[PDB]
Design an enzyme around this catalytic site. Structure first.
Site, PDB file in Angstrom:
ATOM      1  N   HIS A 185      43.551  64.842  15.723  1.00  0.00           N
ATOM      2  CA  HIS A 185      43.682  66.274  15.831  1.00  0.00           C
ATOM      3  C   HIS A 185      42.389  66.753  16.464  1.00  0.00           C
ATOM      4  CE1 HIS A 185      47.356  66.640  13.625  1.00  0.00           C
ATOM      5  NE2 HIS A 185      46.857  66.091  12.531  1.00  0.00           N
TER       6      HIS A 185
ATOM      7  N   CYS B  93      45.363  67.498  19.703  1.00  0.00           N
ATOM      8  CA  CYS B  93      45.683  68.910  19.625  1.00  0.00           C
ATOM      9  C   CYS B  93      45.718  69.241  18.143  1.00  0.00           C
ATOM     10  CB  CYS B  93      47.018  69.193  20.318  1.00  0.00           C
ATOM     11  SG  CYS B  93      48.410  68.330  19.588  1.00  0.00           S
TER      12      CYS B  93
END
Lengths: 239, 241
Positions: free
Chosen positions: A91, A133
């Site tokens: 992430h 992301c």
């Protein structure tokens, strides 16, 4: 001055490829798991070792551990190596990538390999690949682009899975759209084509994956790369 | 049958438009210095891009409203008969913004006018933005820190920046910008043959080579440009028939 000049790629070793693979996160971060990321890792390991890289994978390291590992690779000599590769599968948001327990600014990681701090990579390609992301039986998970797609310094090539305004896709079995297409192109053209031209093929492959015909309609994916390379980059078979 | 050597189709009737927004001075309450040498850049770029077949339109020191009108005007005309589109910003800039004469404009609103929905006739065609912008502050060399975020813009967009974060942009008051000079020299030599990002790479090399070790305060202020490609094919500017 010669328009066809290539990075010197005839050292004893191709160099190291580091892969930081993050599937799960500290409970209190409340981040979803990145299912399918292990397929990305293995796909990348195969492709990069075939191009001659010494691949080192690390799974779910905590910030301290990740910093230790990356600091030591940055301080060992690369004098007899062609280049350096680093992959982050996690992430991320803005200028940060997540380790298991906390965020780390990407620039503190890339900065370890800039010339003042890593003399033996000066003038050598430093390639960072970022599949990151922010997250909200093969299914496709879809998330908005979140990581700023910035360059890193002279002779750095920064490769991002997705650009602002677009969406990243990851299949629970086959892995990320971007990594799949990257590895497929590496497998066919890695050992002959110029690397940015190969990354351009990857842009085309990903951009044309259709998002028409759940609530994922219209969430198109386009990657990008930010180049501060000064020469042509090839990975011809070594010998 | 996937073709690893695929090129953008560049055999339309016209090459396309190259817009140049040239900014030399600013509304006084902005406290932004003059950018002497920018006109050299503008003219250098005009010659090189027209030689590649572009229809070049320059605008000098437009206020924000004028600049927005001018660019919306270009974005709403048909580009059906064009190979591509080029847009150059020669100004001060900061973060996500570029300065018109009187105020900041978000870069994303400028580039967004040419994305799929809003410009159907440019879909699948290269859209190239070149940005010579940072924040200031006889041929003297003026130096300023990188300030404009070097981001991409969308499918088939290629964003080219004079300088990356942590580096410094240089402008000679007579000869113009280090980056534009080198870009233009490479366009003149190689524009007509070399793949465009291959050419931009040569520019990275040229600019990086310019020595920074006349003003003691400017030693060690290295410049390195960068570009951010979301192109999907090879890009050539072979002379048109």
């Amino acid at each position: 001055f010669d328009p066809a000049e290539k990075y010197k790629m005839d050292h004893r070793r191709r160099g190291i490829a580091l892969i930081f693979n993050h599937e799960r996160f500290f409970w209190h971060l409340t981040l979803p798991e990145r299912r399918g990321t292990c397929a990305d890792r293995d796909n990348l390991t195969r492709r990069f070792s075939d191009l001659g890289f010494e691949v080192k994978c690390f799974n779910d390291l905590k910030a301290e551990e990740l910093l230790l590992k990356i600091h030591e690779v940055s301080t060992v000599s690369h004098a007899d190596a062609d280049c350096f590769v680093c992959v982050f599968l996690s992430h991320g948001e803005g200028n940060h990538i997540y380790a298991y327990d906390a965020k780390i600014e990407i620039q503190t990681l890339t900065g370890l390999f800039k010339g003042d701090k890593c003399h033996s990579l000066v003038g050598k390609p430093k390639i960072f690949i970022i599949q990151a992301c922010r997250g909200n039986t093969n299914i496709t998970e879809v998330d908005a682009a979140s990581v700023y797609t910035l360059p890193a310094g002279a002779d750095f090539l920064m490769c991002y899975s997705v650009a602002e305004g677009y969406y990243s896709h990851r299949e629970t079995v086959n892995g990320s759209w971007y990594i799949q297409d990257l590895c497929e192109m590496l497998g066919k053209y890695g050992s002959s084509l110029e690397f940015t031209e190969l990354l351009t093929l990857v842009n085309r492959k990903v951009e044309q994956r259709r998002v028409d015909f759940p609530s994922a309609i219209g969430k198109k994916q386009v990657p990008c790369f930010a180049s501060m390379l000064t020469k042509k980059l090839h990975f011809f078979p070594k010998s």
